[PDB]
Design a binder for this molecule. Structure first.
Ligand SMILES: [Ca+2]
Ligand SMILES: [Ca+2]
Length: 674
């Protein structure tokens, strides 16, 4: 389907100005005008290249032997019978030249005649593409295409588009008046890098779809890197005292976020786990709870999934992960089995898939899962920090590559992510953007390195363009936007060397404001850019943990219903992500306040309804009773507590109340107003 001979069709007589590059499944190398430029639909020369497999005497003929020169394995057979053997592969090259064709397009067929005198256009089952790889195979050797990706040098430099016909793809020069209107993508790439983003798929494989279909759509652009990015998401945890007495475990939900520690030049995969601090009867310590004494040890189970937030799949090794307490006390090393993955882990996906159960760190009947053990002091430290860190390495295994011999994609034992990642990291600018549900998503984009001559052969990459191709920013009416939000609703942060670089650029441009000149800010290799929703406050991991009083209040303004049982509100998915809970209080006529859920571990009274609305439940820690308001003039005040003001342990002096918690008023109404 993606197999056959490769054709270059030129408007000039000497193979200088290619107009179309395309493959044909069979000896029919025609392109009718209906598939086409206009005054440039007159091709005066052409070149086809590929291999032929068969066992007989064969004579070659074309529909135009007078203009044709054809080579089989480097012997001229057209400018005459020749012997070919079954199960062997012969290179083919065909050149054609005609000086003022009066028809547009090309009618051209390649035939052969066997010994039984059967002449026919060569079958698709006999034709294969050239070996457009950085290396020859034992079978198919390779050889105006300096890097051998298949795209002519001049197209890569000057700009090209691919049109998806039904049968196959035409690659042609970009032209303003035809293609900008029709809204086509304008590609440039290096003519000397087989993969301009230094990744394992070629610029030509990308744009013609001869590529692993699990590769992210944006990474089908030759200027956007395709590579996995993997972290571990822990969903819940259960702690146990290490060894017929009763169950004495602590089970808690957990929230995990991939992190980034500034912008910074580290390529590590890490996630930070927050263990829920809310109520799980009594207010015992953890050791009291499990009956741990000072010489006991505890252990930990959890449910996890792997998360691929990059742009290429992983097939046959999940990366290895350290579970770390505090700054550097490794509690465990988590490995899955090499070459025994139950599924691939695709971009923007989980392993296991969400429709299947998660992985238990100590799985049911797995006899050799290592206990994740803590000594007593480590246990107390976990109680107090309620935090773990998962450090995941970048060992991702073998790559699924396109095979030009059979037009198939398969895991190639000879190709490995560890051979590609370093050069990807070396030749691209990195942007981390959180505009999608506030999680940190990293992309890398081909960008010039002025100090490295090869990298100066790549097209200029602007900040604006980068954001459009790597993250799907668009500009529907003069303004760059991500899914409806203007770019000005996000901040820019850079590492120190990038910051200096960008400051020099703006001064050169006499620009005072970065947002009005994104189209003129150039990106270089090794830059690091962090772009974050401005509504939010972020911690040192760049996770969203707060927001302005004004933003929080505004987001709660629209109230659907209120009563003595609770509140029913529409709250933005994003705001909800920065809140740990609510505090409900009745304020009497003299100003004194009765706090109803007055404990740091009893703030979890919001819940997401199946209809998307939020219910704030007054009954839950009021002993299942609606609020009792002894006087209609009393007020019911409700407060939001952001995660960065959340208290996660009793206070120093032992107080477990909400006293002193920094909280944001978001609802206040008298008894008679409810
Ligand atoms: Ca090329
Ligand atoms: Ca290239």
């Amino acid at each position: 389907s993606s197999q056959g001979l490769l054709g270059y069709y030129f408007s000039d007589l000497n193979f200088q100005a290619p107009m179309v590059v395309t493959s044909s499944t069979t000896g029919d190398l025609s392109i009718p005008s209906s598939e086409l430029p206009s005054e440039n639909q007159y091709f005066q020369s052409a070149i086809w290249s590929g291999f032929i497999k068969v066992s007989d005497e064969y004579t070659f003929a074309t529909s135009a032997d007078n203009h044709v020169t054809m080579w089989v394995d480097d012997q001229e057979v057209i400018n005459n019978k020749i012997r070919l053997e079954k199960g062997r592969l012969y290179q083919i090259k065909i050149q054609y030249q005609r000086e003022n064709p009066t028809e547009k397009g090309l009618d051209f067929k390649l035939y052969w005649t066997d010994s039984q005198n059967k002449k026919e256009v060569i079958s698709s089952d006999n034709l294969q593409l050239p070996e457009l790889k950085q290396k020859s195979s034992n079978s198919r050797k390779k050889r105006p295409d300096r890097d051998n990706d298949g795209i002519p040098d001049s197209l890569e430099v000057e700009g090209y588009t691919v049109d998806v016909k039904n049968k196959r793809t035409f690659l042609s020069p970009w032209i303003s008046n035809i293609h900008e209107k029709k809204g086509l993508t304008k590609y440039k790439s290096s003519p000397e890098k087989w993969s301009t983003a230094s990744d394992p798929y070629s610029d030509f494989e990308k744009v013609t779809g001869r590529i692993d279909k699990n590769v992210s759509p944006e990474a089908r652009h030759p200027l956007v890197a395709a590579y996995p990015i993997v972290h571990v998401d822990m969903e819940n945890i259960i702690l146990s005292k290490n060894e017929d007495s009763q169950t004495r475990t602590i089970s808690k939900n957990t929230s995990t976020s991939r992190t980034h520690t500034s912008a910074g030049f580290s390529n590590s995969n890490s996630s930070t786990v927050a263990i829920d601090h809310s109520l799980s009867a009594g207010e015992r310590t953890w050791a009291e709870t499990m009956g741990l004494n000072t010489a006991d040890t505890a252990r930990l189970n959890a449910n996890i999934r792997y998360v691929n937030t990059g742009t290429a799949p992983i097939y046959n090794v999940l990366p290895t992960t350290s579970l770390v307490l505090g700054k550097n006390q490794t509690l465990a090393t988590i490995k899955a089995k090499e070459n025994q993955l139950s599924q691939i882990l695709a971009p923007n996906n989980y392993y296991p898939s969400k429709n299947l159960a998660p992985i238990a760190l100590n799985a049911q009947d797995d006899f050799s899962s290592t206990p994740i053990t803590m000594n007593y002091n480590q246990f107390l430290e976990l109680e107090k920090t309620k935090q773990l860190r998962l450090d995941t390495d970048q060992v991702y295994g073998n790559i699924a590559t396109y095979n030009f011999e059979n037009g198939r994609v398969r895991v190639d034992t000879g190709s490995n992510w560890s051979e590609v990642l370093p050069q990807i990291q070396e030749t691209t600018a990195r942007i981390i953007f959180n505009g999608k549900d506030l999680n940190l998503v990293e992309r890398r984009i081909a960008a010039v390195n002025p100090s490295d001559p090869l990298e100066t052969t790549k097209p200029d990459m602007t900040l604006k363009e980068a954001l459009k191709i790597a993250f799907g920013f668009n500009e529907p009416n003069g303004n760059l936007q991500y899914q409806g939000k203007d770019i000005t609703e996000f901040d820019f942060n850079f590492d120190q060397q990038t910051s200096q670089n960008i400051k020099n650029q703006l001064a050169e441009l006499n620009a005072t404001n970065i947002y009005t000149v994104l189209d003129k800010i150039k990106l270089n290799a090794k830059m690091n850019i962090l772009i974050r929703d401005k509504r939010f406050h972020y911690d040192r991991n760049n996770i969203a943990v707060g927001a302005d009083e004004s933003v929080v209040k505004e987001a709660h303004r629209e109230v659907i219903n209120s009563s003595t049982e609770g509140l029913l509100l529409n709250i933005d998915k994003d705001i909800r992500k920065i809140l740990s809970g609510y505090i409900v209080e009745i304020e009497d006529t003299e100003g004194l306040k009765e706090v109803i859920n007055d404990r740091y571990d009893m703030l979890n009274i919001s819940s997401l309804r199946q209809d998307g609305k939020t219910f704030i439940d007054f009954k839950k820690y009021n002993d299942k009773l609606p609020l009792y308001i002894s006087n209609p003039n009393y007020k019911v005040n409700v407060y939001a507590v952001t995660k960065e003001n959340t208290i996660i342990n009793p206070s120093e002096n032992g107080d477990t109340s909400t006293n002193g918690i920094k909280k944001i008023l978001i609802f206040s109404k008298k008894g008679y107003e409810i």
